[PDB]
Amino acid sequence: ANFLKNLHPLLRRDRNKKDNQDPNFALIDALNEEMNQVEKDAIESKLQSSLKTSTSEYLDKFGDWFGVYRKTDEKDDVYRARIIKYLLLKRGTNNAIIDAI
C-alpha cells in the first residue's frame, strides 16, 4: 500500500477542492483500493501456510499429506485436532487398545 508514495510526484494525491467529481482522484482511489485489498489478502495468506491456522482447502491439503481425510460436515478445528491426534497415537499396549475401542 505504497501506491501513492511511489506514484509520480506531480500527480495529485488529494481530491481537488475546485471539483467534487474529480476523475483523477476517483481513478487513484480505485487503484489504491485494489492495492490495499491485495496487501490485506497477502497478509492474511500466512494463516494458510501453517497447520495451526489453516482453513478448509489448505487444511484438506495438509490432511491429504498426513493421510487423514475430512468427514461429512467436519469443521476445521475438530479436523486439525483429529490429524494431530492421529499423528500422536500410542500403539502396542492395553491402554492404547482401550482408547481405540
Add this chain to the structure above:
Amino acid sequence: ANSGTFVMDDGRKNHVPAYMVAVALGGLASGLEIGESITFKPLRVSSLD
C-alpha cells in the same frame, strides 16, 4: 446589451443578466494599461442569449 451564461470554475452555470457582463468588461478594462481599449478583446464567456 448582451447577457449570457458564464461557466463558473465551481461548475455552476451562471445564467446571469447583462450587468454581470458589464462587471466582466470592467474587470477586463481595469487590468488593461492606460490608453488601451476593450475593443476586439475576448470576453471569456461560454454563451450569450
